Design a binder for this molecule. Structure first.
Ligand SMILES: *[C@@H]1O[C@H](CO)[C@@H](O)[C@H](O)[C@H]1NC(C)=O
Ligand SMILES: *[C@@H]1O[C@H](CO)[C@@H](O)[C@H](O)[C@H]1NC(C)=O
Lengths: 99, 593
């Protein structure tokens, strides 16, 4: 019961926006005043994960990698291909861009 | 706006209802596969919390007015939620009704009927009396057990039924119903669209219309069974009279399937039993359920889930835990589908595994529906979609395809006729009993039968409709219906009638989809994906639509049709014509011995 999700919200989320608010969702015309009930729902509902669920309801962990480029120098640059070194022979060399 | 409030209310209700229903269903599964006091009490608070949550949400759901709701799925969900049931009463009257129901259950489960001058061999029904009705051939011992169970139930259950009728009528009229039979008939009510409108008061006349032409087939079958029982009992049964109530193979005459050794056409021809072929090839319960899954993926239904194989018990565990021998398919929620079965290596358990996997596929198909619409279209659809799989699994073609029956099998007409007669004794013989019992319950709850004219009315209609006479006269101190399990535990009985009709309707629809050019009873729906798609057009619906629309989606009709039932039994009906020329088809209401 430690995994929650938001089921009710007044307006749709903007991209890469979070909402950690626990304000009571007013679905009607009467003011909620912080107390749940009829037409007054708590927005956070629990992902009651159990190991005997079906595959469409079993918990899935998701990591979203978002890549951005800015005017700054791009300092996240992954592995570069390297081959073995051969000496005493006329070969085409390329070290750090220098060919 | 009211409809958006109802949408947000249903959105808030659905997830908590799914969670609490899963907890209640998991506690019930933990009790049913592991019987102890801790699992029983865990089931008790789980069911109490789930029922209390359902009722407190239904009180809020009754505040919505359905005259300004345009979306029919939201209106159907709010119709399903607003069924309060027995909670509409006061606390005293509800406590009295629950006390009466629970003491009926505990007096039916522990009723004991035993012998003059022999008190020591004193028997419950469940180990011994069903064996006496199924096996014994002595007339006086059956008259003993029948009259004793009628006495030792009816004398104790007549006044309990007297207040039971009044309190159930008050329960129905607190929910704006005419009577408790009308409350049961409100499960068949359909309100959506135009041309799909079905009413409660229509249902009774539809049942009578569908009983108007099963009656010649039942009359011929009754005449043949009466003649074979006259061969069995020489002078105790009249040729023109009705059958005695204690010679029908059951406690009540509900199923005639125990009369098959007595009423066999051809005793020298064996049955289509393939149990010994399973024992010779070393089959177990896992291979039975894998062959059922192979059948369902051959017809086009999806595979079984991994949690189905992981969590179901398919064998007697023998680990010291008590289990219920009754097979049951469980839809626990959140994609959890299980089967509780004590599978022996038999053909009957193979067909029962196909039946419960039909239940499992029915539960799996409407999982995409909302929680309040995850039911059958009506009460007959859920068992009909298992009975069609039980029909298709028993064919000689399916057993020859999977190697259970040899390839050089010659299926002559004699074993086909006696297979069809066994199916008729199981299937056709329960229909006048079902129509009688539900007609009597509807007339008692409506008040069409006066209170002091109960028993003699009942034995009138059994002299009239079913064609079965009482062995001894009964006065109004008896309560002769109440000896049955379904009426002493508050269960609807017309679901078996609608099951029987929808079963053969679905069977003709799936065999016309599979393009089978032979007779209906030889038809196999295996290796036919278009029949599976025609089936999944209905199974994916749930009760989101009216049941007439789902019925038109399968068979192209909007009502019950028994022409498929007479077309299934057509060679047998011709055979029953061929051996009833000299006999008298029909019965006399006057008591003939
Ligand atoms: C059945 O219930 C008892 C109750 O304590 C428990 O000890 C046992 O482990 C249960 N069996 C299974 C298979 O879970
Ligand atoms: C249906 O397909 C299965 C798949 O192996 C096959 O074994 C079976 O013989 C087929 N049935 C018919 C009637 O061809």
């Amino acid at each position: 019961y430690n995994y929650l999700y938001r089921l009710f919200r007044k307006s749709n989320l903007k991209p890469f926006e979070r909402d950690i608010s626990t304000e009571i969702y007013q679905a009607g015309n009467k003011p909620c005043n912080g107390v749940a009930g009829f037409n007054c729902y708590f927005p956070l509902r629990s992902y009651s994960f159990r190991p005997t669920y079906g595959v469409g309801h079993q918990p899935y962990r998701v990591v979203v990698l978002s890549f951005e480029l800015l005017h700054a120098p791009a300092t996240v640059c992954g592995p570069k291909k390297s081959t073995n070194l051969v000496k005493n022979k006329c070969v085409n060399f390329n070290f750090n861009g220098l060919k | 706006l009211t409809e958006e409030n109802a949408k947000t209310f249903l959105n808030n209700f659905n997830q908590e209802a799914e969670d609490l229903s899963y907890q209640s269903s998991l506690a019930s599964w933990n009790y049913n596969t592991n019987i102890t006091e801790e699992n029983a009490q865990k089931m008790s608070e789980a069911a109490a919390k789930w029922s209390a949550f359902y009722e407190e949400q239904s009180k809020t759901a009754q505040s919505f007015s359905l005259q300004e709701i345009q979306t029919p799925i939201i209106k159907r969900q709010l119709q399903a939620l607003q069924q309060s049931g027995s909670s509409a009463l006061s606390a005293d009257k509800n406590k009295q009704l629950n006390t009466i129901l629970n003491t009926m259950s505990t007096i039916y489960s522990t009723g004991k009927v035993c012998n003059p001058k022999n008190p020591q061999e004193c028997l419950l029904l469940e180990p011994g009396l069903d064996e006496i009705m199924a096996t014994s051939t002595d007339y006086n011992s059956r008259l003993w057990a029948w009259e004793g169970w009628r006495a030792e139930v009816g004398k104790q259950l007549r006044p309990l039924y007297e207040e039971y009728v009044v309190l159930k009528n008050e329960m129905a009229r607190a929910n704006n119903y005419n009577d408790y039979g009308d409350y049961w008939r409100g499960d068949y009510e359909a309100e959506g669209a135009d041309g799909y409108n079905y009413n409660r008061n229509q249902l009774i006349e539809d049942v009578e219309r569908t009983f108007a032409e099963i009656k010649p087939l039942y009359e011929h079958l009754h005449a043949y069974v009466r003649r074979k029982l006259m061969d069995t009992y020489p002078s105790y049964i009249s040729p023109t009279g009705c059958l005695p109530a204690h010679l029908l193979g059951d406690m009540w005459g509900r199923f005639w399937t125990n009369l098959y050794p007595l009423t066999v056409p051809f005793a020298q021809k064996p049955n289509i039993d393939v149990t010994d072929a399973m024992m010779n090839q070393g089959w177990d319960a896992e291979r039975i359920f894998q062959e059922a899954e192979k059948f369902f993926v051959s017809v086009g239904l999806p595979h079984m889930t991994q949690g189905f194989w992981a969590n179901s018990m398919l064998t007697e565990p023998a680990d010291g835990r008590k289990v219920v021998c009754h097979p049951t398919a469980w839809d626990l929620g959140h994609g959890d589908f299980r089967i509780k079965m004590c599978t022996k290596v038999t053909m009957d358990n193979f067909l029962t595994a196909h039946h419960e996997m039909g239940h499992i596929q029915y539960d799996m198909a409407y999982a995409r529906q909302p929680f309040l619409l995850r039911n059958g279209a009506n009460e007959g659809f859920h068992e009909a979609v298992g009975e069609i799989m039980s029909l298709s699994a028993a064919t000689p073609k399916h057993l020859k395809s999977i190697g259970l029956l040899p390839s050089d099998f010659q299926e002559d007409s004699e074993t086909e006729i006696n297979f069809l007669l066994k199916q008729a004794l199981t299937i056709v013989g329960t229909l006048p009993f079902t129509y009688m019992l539900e007609k009597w319950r509807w007339m008692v709850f409506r008040g069409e039968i006066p209170k002091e004219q109960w028993m003699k009315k009942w034995w009138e209609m059994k002299r009239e409709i079913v064609g079965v006479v009482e062995p001894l006269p009964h006065d109004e101190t008896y309560c002769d219906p109440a000896s049955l399990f379904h009426v002493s535990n508050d269960y609807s009985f017309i679901r078996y009638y609608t099951r029987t009709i929808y079963q053969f309707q679905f069977q003709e629809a799936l065999c016309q989809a599979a393009k089978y050019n032979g007779s209906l009873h030889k038809c196999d729906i295996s290796n036919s994906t278009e029949a599976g798609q025609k089936l999944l057009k209905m199974l994916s619906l749930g009760n989101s639509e009216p049941w007439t629309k789902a019925l038109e989606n399968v068979v192209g009709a909007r009502n019950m049709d028994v022409k498929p039932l007479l077309n299934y039994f057509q060679p047998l009906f011709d055979w029953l014509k061929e051996q009833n020329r000299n006999s008298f088809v029909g019965w006399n209401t006057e008591w003939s011995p």
